[PDB]
From a paper:
This results in perfectly straight repeat proteins in which each repeat unit is translated but not rotated relative to the previous unit. We tested 33 linear THRs (with Δh = 0) with helices either about 20 or about 40 residues in height; 23 of 33 tested designs were solubly expressed, and 13 of 19 designs analysed by SEC were primarily monomeric as designed.
We construct twistless helix repeat (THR) protein blocks from identical straight α-helices (typically 2–4 helices in each unit); the length of the blocks can be varied simply by varying the number of repeat units.
Residue numbers in the entry: 1 to 201
Write the structure that this text describes.
């Protein structure tokens, strides 16, 4: 279990190095290969009954590596890895659900993935930040549903929902009018999901 994390983390760092050495042309193939390796390692830890902290460490290790590639990479590469980063985080949140992880580890992993998306949008242009906001919103709604299936706590749902609230608000200050208008719709959909999760608890 813990040896699976150590070998997986070695590969994630090994791929990250070859992403930095190579140009941005190969950085996307390495980013996709880094997430597929991390996702496959999460399933091995899933069927092995690993502690949820190992799942979070492995997930965050791959989330940081993906973020590092997006930061080094251009504007087009930023949005691509963001999709990869959220897809990998949604897989990880569902493994933590299957294991019945503590709700605090769910928020921890979700905050980590949401902060990385916020960093990618900040480094990106205006049309960049709109798609990140949709990605960020859909990830936060997934994490709210995971907390709903785990009992959670009214303060944890409020904490995660407001973390996504402040993240989306920071994107509104990032771009012009058409972005600030779409953030309001995005904020409404998010607040609607947190409305139902707080209702059923």
């Amino acid at each position: 279990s813990e040896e699976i994390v150590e070998e997986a983390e070695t590969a994630l760092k090994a791929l990250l190095e070859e992403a930095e050495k190579g140009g941005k042309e190969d950085a996307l193939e390495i980013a996709e290969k880094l997430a597929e390796l991390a996702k496959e390692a999460l399933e091995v830890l899933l069927e092995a009954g690993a502690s949820p902290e190992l799942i979070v460490r492995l997930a965050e290790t791959a989330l940081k590596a993906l973020l590092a590639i997006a930061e080094l990479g251009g504007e087009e590469l930023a949005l691509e890895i963001a999709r990869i980063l959220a897809e990998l985080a949604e897989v990880a949140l569902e493994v933590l659900l299957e294991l019945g992880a503590s709700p605090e580890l769910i928020v921890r992993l979700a905050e980590t993935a949401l902060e990385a998306l916020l960093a990618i949008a900040r480094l990106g242009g205006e049309e960049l930040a709109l798609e990140i906001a949709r990605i960020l919103a859909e990830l936060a709604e997934v994490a709210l549903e995971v907390l709903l299936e785990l009992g959670a706590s009214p303060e944890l749902i409020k904490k995660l929902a407001e973390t996504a609230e402040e993240a989306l608000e920071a994107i509104a200050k990032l771009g012009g009018e058409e972005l600030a208008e779409e953030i309001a719709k995005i904020l409404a959909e998010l607040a609607e999901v947190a409305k139902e999760v707080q209702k059923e608890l």
